[PDB]
Amino acid sequence: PQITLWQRPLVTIKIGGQLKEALLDTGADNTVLEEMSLPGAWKPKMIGGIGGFIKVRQYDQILIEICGHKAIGTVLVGPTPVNIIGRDLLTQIGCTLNF
Amino acid sequence: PQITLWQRPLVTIKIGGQLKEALLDTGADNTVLEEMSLPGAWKPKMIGGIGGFIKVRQYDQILIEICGHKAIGTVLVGPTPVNIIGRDLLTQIGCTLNF
Ligand SMILES: Cc1c(O)cccc1C(=O)N[C@@H](CSc1ccccc1)[C@H](O)CN1C[C@H]2CCCC[C@H]2C[C@H]1C(=O)NC(C)(C)C
Numbered sequence: 001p002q003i004t005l006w007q008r009p010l011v012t013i014k015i016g017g018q019l020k021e022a023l024l025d026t027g028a029d030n031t032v033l034e035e036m037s038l039p040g041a042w043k044p045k046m047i048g049g050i051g052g053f054i055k056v057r058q059y060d061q062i063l064i065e066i067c068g069h070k071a072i073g074t075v076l077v078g079p080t081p082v083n084i085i086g087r088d089l090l091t092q093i094g095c096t097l098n099f
Numbered sequence: 100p101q102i103t104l105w106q107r108p109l110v111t112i113k114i115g116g117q118l119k120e121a122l123l124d125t126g127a128d129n130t131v132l133e134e135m136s137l138p139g140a141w142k143p144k145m146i147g148g149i150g151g152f153i154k155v156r157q158y159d160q161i162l163i164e165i166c167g168h169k170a171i172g173t174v175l176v177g178p179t180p181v182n183i184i185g186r187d188l189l190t191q192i193g194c195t196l197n198f
Contacts, residue, residue, distance in 0.1 A: 003196040005186040009125050024196055026108050027124030027183060032149070049149030050131070050179055069198065080149055084126060087104040097102040097123055099168070099194040 001067065002098075013083070014065035015075070020083050022066070026097060028086030031064075032076040038062055047076060054078050069093040100166060112182070113164035114174070119182055121165070125196060127185030130163075131175040137161055144175060153177050168192040 003009050009024040016038050030047060042057040056078030063072050066085060071092035102108050108123040115137050129146060141156040155177030163170050165184060170191035 001198055005125055005189045005194060005196070008128070008186075009196055023126050025124070025126030026104060026196075027122050027126045029107070047149065048180075050146065050183075051148050051151030051153050053150045067198075081147075084149075087107070090104045093198050095104060095196055095198040097104070097108055097125070097194055098197050099100055099166070099192050 011067040011085070013067075013085070015062065022083035022085045024090065024095065025084045025086055026090065028084050029088065030076050030084075030086045031073065031089045032056065032078060032080045032084040032086070034077075034080055034083055036077060038075065038077065042077075045076060047078075054080065064089065066093050110166045110184070112184070114161065121182035121184045123189065123194065124183045124185055125189065127183050128187065129175050129183075129185045130172060130188045131155060131177060131179045131183040131185070133176075133179055133182055135176060137174065137176065141176075146175060146177075153179065155179075163188065165192050 010021050013022045038059045045056045045058045056076040059075050062075045073089050112121045137158045141158050144155045144157040155175040158174045161174040170188050172188045
């Protein structure tokens, strides 16, 4: 699967039994999801982007299906306006930039 | 040129006669550079990411060299902590996500 970038690279993901749309984001170090509940313990965390910072809950060893590829990683949950798939998970699905 | 994502995808750019490092960012709609001066008119603009918004100056029809590929696009200039190459320019150099 090749994905061109003329439109936002939004893919379907499955996480915590739920189906969501998320943006494949090579500029994000971490994967950040809009508010939802997940299993295990979590830790308070802060992540900065353009403009400022948000408070997030960090969950470890979470199973995620990304465009029908399975990966297990750390997911952050918090007041992001878009679900973000960052490099931590992009590497796990063998995602590369090519030109 | 393929670029894997184990590290931040930082490339060399040349813009306004200057050499800079920038992040190939499929999660950004627009290209945003740290403070610098550029030719022609500019228009005030506000852009949001995670955490909040920043005020930027928008410059049109700017020549940029990205990984040694020439592109002419709109460049935003403002208080970003990282130079960001967004989809507007990524499409111009024929950049795709592959897995
Ligand atoms: C630069 C830009 C535009 O021109 C237009 C729309 C969005 C953005 C934008 O900032 N996008 C971001 C995703 S967060 C996001 C928010 C809203 C919509 C889509 C993505 C970047 O791809 C990632 N972005 C790149 C970079 C931006 C400058 C600050 C340091 C990083 C922070 C990082 C980021 O925010 N990462 C999180 C882990 C906090 C998610």
